[PDB]
Amino acid sequence: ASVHGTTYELLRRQGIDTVFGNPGSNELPFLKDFPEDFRYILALQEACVVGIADGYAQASRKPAFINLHSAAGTGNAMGALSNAWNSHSPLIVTAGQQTRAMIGVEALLTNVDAANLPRPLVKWSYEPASAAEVPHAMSRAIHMASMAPQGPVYLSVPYDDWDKDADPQSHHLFDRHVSSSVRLNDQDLDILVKALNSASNPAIVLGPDVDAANANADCVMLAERLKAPVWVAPSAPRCPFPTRHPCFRGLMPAGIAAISQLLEGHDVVLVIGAPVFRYHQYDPGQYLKPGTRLISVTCDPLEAARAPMGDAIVADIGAMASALANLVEESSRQLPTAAPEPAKVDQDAGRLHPETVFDTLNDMAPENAIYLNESTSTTAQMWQRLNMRNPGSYYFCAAGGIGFALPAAIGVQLAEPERQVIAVIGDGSANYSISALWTAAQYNIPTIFVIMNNGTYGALRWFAGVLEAENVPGLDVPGIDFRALAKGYGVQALKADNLEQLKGSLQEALSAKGPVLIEVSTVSP
Amino acid sequence: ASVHGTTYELLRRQGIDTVFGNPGSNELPFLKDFPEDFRYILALQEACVVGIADGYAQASRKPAFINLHSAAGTGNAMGALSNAWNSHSPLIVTAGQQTRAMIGVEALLTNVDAANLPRPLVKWSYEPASAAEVPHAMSRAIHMASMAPQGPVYLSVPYDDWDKDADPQSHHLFDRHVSSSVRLNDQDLDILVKALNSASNPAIVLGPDVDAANANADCVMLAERLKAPVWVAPSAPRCPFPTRHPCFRGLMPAGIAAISQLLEGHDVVLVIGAPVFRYHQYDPGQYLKPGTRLISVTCDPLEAARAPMGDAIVADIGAMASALANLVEESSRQLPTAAPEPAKVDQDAGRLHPETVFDTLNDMAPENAIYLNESTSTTAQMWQRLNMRNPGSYYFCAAGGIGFALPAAIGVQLAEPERQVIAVIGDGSANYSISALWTAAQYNIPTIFVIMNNGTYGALRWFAGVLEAENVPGLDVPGIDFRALAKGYGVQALKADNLEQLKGSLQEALSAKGPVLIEVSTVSP
Amino acid sequence: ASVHGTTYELLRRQGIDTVFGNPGSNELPFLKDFPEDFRYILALQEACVVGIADGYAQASRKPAFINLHSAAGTGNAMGALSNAWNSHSPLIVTAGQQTRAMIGVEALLTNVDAANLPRPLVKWSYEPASAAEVPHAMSRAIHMASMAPQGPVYLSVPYDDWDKDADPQSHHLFDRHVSSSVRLNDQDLDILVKALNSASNPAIVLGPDVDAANANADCVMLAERLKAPVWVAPSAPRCPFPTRHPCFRGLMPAGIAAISQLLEGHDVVLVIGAPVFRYHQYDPGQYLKPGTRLISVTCDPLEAARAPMGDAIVADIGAMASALANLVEESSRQLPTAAPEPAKVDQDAGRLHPETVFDTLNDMAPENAIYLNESTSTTAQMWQRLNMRNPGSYYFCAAGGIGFALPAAIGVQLAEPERQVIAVIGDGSANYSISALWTAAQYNIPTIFVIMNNGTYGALRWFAGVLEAENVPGLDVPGIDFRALAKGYGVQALKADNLEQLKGSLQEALSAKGPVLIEVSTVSP
């Protein structure tokens, strides 16, 4: 067998059947004779390729395979890799290298010092020392991406390797099963359970690795048994809990002092599947108030090491959440009462308040919709106004890198063909990966894109008002016609300049059989 | 509080009370006002500092703290770090940096691009962005070294940071408890246990992480229940099993074909706490024969990913070994019968055969002796001839980097003051870290050093005879007087030119109250 | 031809005929069939191998070739590489890698992520992607080490590459000539020359790249023409000027304020072949006083970029020094008058003052002696008391990394067989690379080693008295018998406990036909 045949056999035997890519000449020997049982999803720029793959991996809860062109293609994708690192996304990023005979002379398209290029944003990065090693290196990549804590990995392959003969011992790679589905030993787990059973006023904080593990329902059971309020850890990349469950208390503010004040009076705070904590604004104060202790369950040693407070347990979130939910006692405390519904903000017949937009989406979207957020100044309102009952219902760029939601929403919609995906994206953010729209059109992936158009980088302008920072350049983005951009890439486009038009456009988009972009005129901040 | 006071408080609160070091001016602000409850162990060169610390950490099964001088001191230690990486040794390596005000100009003693220097041999490498971050960075270092898979870490600290004020919120670092004591979830553990119960002819292979976890006794129970032969994985850094237990089958040959032939006919091979596998010679063939399947339990994702065959489970070795040993059925198969004793090799009244040396050590050493091996051409005979009943009884340079055993034997003897340490070191290997002898003399650490003097790099000369490689330079090391070197560093020295003298020298060394070096004239290979 | 034959042909065609090494199994396929026209210099530990090679390269003013064993051997050498980076030493460091077929599994002795290991201490670091690329990669290494600014480079080679067939087009590598012998264009050089001609009170500061370029005599002509005082830039690795020439003013103090005070009143300060500046102690103040401007000529862009003041020209030091010395006018100012001789310090019949030692060396050593300094508390006195008339007469560890002078003095003596090398090394420093003595004995390289024994790390104890730092551990090194260490490695040894014995020992050492070590009892600081 050839390295090509052996590698595709390893991929299919490990569950991989889709290649997200933007091709180049170093990759043609890999992509030739593309197997009939695989599919190839083309995107027009590499941030879009990796964003699509990332949404697909996060929603499918399985690795996604990517093929990029040498250094330039890899480089175009590295902002997307920054988000994938923070979301623990299992991405297998491959890139083609020059033929081994011209690597030394640095022919055009040589990826120099290739493994260092995507660092520090990958768990593992490698170029094999010979063609026959390529299947084993690919096996390493698959398992490194997939073991907890999951994350992106990178493999560079000289184009001449694919046609060489494979090692006949590579067959042992095909069916390897590697598990990291582990939980704390019984003695120490019993100590943790007793601590939770004994707490007088416990609180629970959940992060994105809960939703990645599909541990959401177990965490509902845990919160019901402990009769504990549940918050989502700050800067949340995913939604780990039903947002109208009586225990739910919302998204935590991303500040040190704000979080310790919020947790004041809780004697034990159990954090599951989050860093401790993804703060954003600098809000100095106490990490925890006197009387509060924190216990973190994380899948990532790097998270456990850097937490500034609390105990930690490094283990699989699915296994831990299941064990805790089934072991704790039912507290005799009263179940927390549900948060009240948000108020309706006054809305005239002009430009839309973001609150109106989210209320109307919540009114009209199916109960199993999936939302993506890259409307950076409206995140708090979004989290208050969307009832998200089910797992896998929310994605936000985990490293704060905009240009994620537009392509990721296409990958999520590909992963979940029976759940309507609605991406809510600011007019600034929409441009970063605008060309991803073409992939939705070409493959008829029926994502809905709601562009919140207020003409400015609102989140920045706010943080500039915060600091009384005068004379900051570059905050306004006037003069973009998003319906013409959608037409450019073959996507049906609608405009909503007021509420009546918003409702009508959403009704049309929800009935449509392909992707739709709605440009919404929103109020200036 | 100062950063200095806060950092030493964090160290003591996390169980650290000893600094292994070789000082320099960037470190004086850290070492000044050295706390009375700590001790400082000086060694004369940094390979020796880190080797001593490494033996201390491996034998104590806890992290060791190291302080080195800037780039040059760190650099002198990087061969020692290569072994520590392969042995999973929890080493906290700190190095002093120039004052922040002259880092930019690259004053003398600036460690340029410091965090990149020890890569790729550390799990985590960092320089803090401000003085007040130093305690948190030290907390990160402690936990990164200590979480599974354990390993060395590196922290660079500008010398002006120590006297600055600490953050009052650093107190939350002091008592953090971080656990990685995890095992496979119940459902999948039951599947593994059923597979072991069902095997017709299981074999067990153990590596160094068994001894690190003190999982040895559990692995004895497991092997007794399964009635299975037990081998030690190749290139063994530690001894994970009593070597005269009836199940014991010795050290595996470090070759692909040799191992698959050895395992032929075993239907299930359970590997615990080893890479799969640390081969050495290239001995191409099948990874496993038809009829053999392999299951690996490893504490290290990198090991699970790179295994060329078998299933893997990434979990804590102590937790897994305990759970398996207590869950498996007692097989009705007959217990394996013990290997016969090794034969006595003929010995005249001249230079010593290595076999004679090991037999005589086994005859005379206490039953709880601890051995170190850096006599590279005699490893197989050593493993056949020393009865090592207890855990923590054997160390060999895990990356093959000689210069480990002499200093490590001093650290092991410091960790285990009531177990006699006997390091068996070739005349070539003895030179690499010869100055470590001084630390044994100064602190009166009573290690015994047995120098196997045959005048040549025997293991190399053998691998050169193997390849029929003629005209290789640099293989002979004539003209070294090891008793004069020992005298140079204050260690009592004896010579053994024949068996009578070997016996007499060992009797004197075993009765001595300080370190002793015995130079043994061994046969030329 | 094989890769082996082609590579040795490239080496000989590029002027390389010596391999400094400590062998291992990954290197046996390179070292087998070692060519008859090459020589191999063995040292017993890799810091010693690289130190010897470094002294040889610096004194010969040509690249030196090194062969080390995998990661552990490379790692043992990285403190030596830190000095070589600061001295711009042209070192070609090669290390053997595992066979390509087992790199993936990480067999014992695999150098993982090899090119990252010696970073950031090398100019270029590489592992070739195929056997046939090895000669081209070696060509790259030779030229990268040798082009200005010279420096160490690293090449990792899988052991199976050597026996493979070479590319027949590799012959084009053999006779490549690469030049960096460049100087500032005529128009701008005329502007510089006019600035020097016009200065009212110029000063000249010289660094180690002057001595590397053998630009010393040109700099004497330049200073005579400009009638300018000459200082050596601080932390000096080499001596760039005759130390009793009337213009000579000594070694600059390694402090910001001290240097600007020294230069006060000089209108133009021309620095040649030095960083601006290698300060050490933090001595904050003005970089330059009002009225002083600085112009630096450096071979290293990194030096030009990081200078905190002055103009800079990046060019070859030999070409620039020659052009300036021949273009400037003869000033009508009076030539500076020579510094007076140093005073004789009072000396009783007991332990030796370092000043007495240097005076006696100056009295007895040949006029073309070469000195090395690793007696860190006595550097100022050494520079005052040794008349060094000739180029290549002084070496000091350029990164401050002790363990350089003992092995480097053996390499320098090998490079300069007709100039007596005298290394003056403190008792602390002597231990770091003590095993290098064996190479002097084995090859009969007649270096003289003068050990300054005061029982302590004196330079540290002084900088601890400076800071009033109490309770610093690890500063004393009692209990070392250096005559027994020398005997251990086959070197004749003498002791000098007073002046009469110092004189007698030096007379015996200077007449000896092999290496000699003199242990001198010096006063405690």
Ligand SMILES: Cc1ncc(Cn2c(C)c(CCOP(=O)(O)OP(=O)(O)O)sc2=O)c(N)n1
């Ligand atoms: C890749 C990238 N570039 C720039 C930024 C900085 N940035 C910018 C430019 C934001 C403005 C997004 O504007 P928007 O129109 O999408 O939404 P809002 O008006 O609601 O803020 S939010 C933010 O963090 C970023 N996060 N990521």
Ligand SMILES: Cc1ncc(Cn2c(C)c(CCOP(=O)(O)OP(=O)(O)O)sc2=O)c(N)n1
């Ligand atoms: C740091 C380093 N340098 C070089 C080597 C290469 N090497 C060398 C030089 C060995 C010879 C050791 O000789 P010895 O006298 O200690 O023992 P034997 O004579 O029994 O081989 S074994 C080996 O792997 C190495 N492994 N590690």
Ligand SMILES: Cc1ncc(Cn2c(C)c(CCOP(=O)(O)OP(=O)(O)O)sc2=O)c(N)n1
């Ligand atoms: C490789 C390394 N380790 C440690 C140091 C720190 N250090 C040490 C330990 C010195 C003491 C040298 O003592 P010595 O006996 O050689 O000479 P003095 O007594 O004259 O200082 S000087 C110095 O910078 C260093 N520079 N380089």
Ligand SMILES: [Ca+2]
């Ligand atoms: Ca098909």
Ligand SMILES: [Ca+2]
């Ligand atoms: Ca906007």
Ligand SMILES: [Ca+2]
């Ligand atoms: Ca004490």
Ligand SMILES: [Ca+2]
């Ligand atoms: Ca030997």
Ligand SMILES: [Ca+2]
């Ligand atoms: Ca010859």
Ligand SMILES: [Ca+2]
């Ligand atoms: Ca001294």
Ligand code: NA
């Ligand atoms: Na990079």
Ligand code: NA
């Ligand atoms: Na490095």
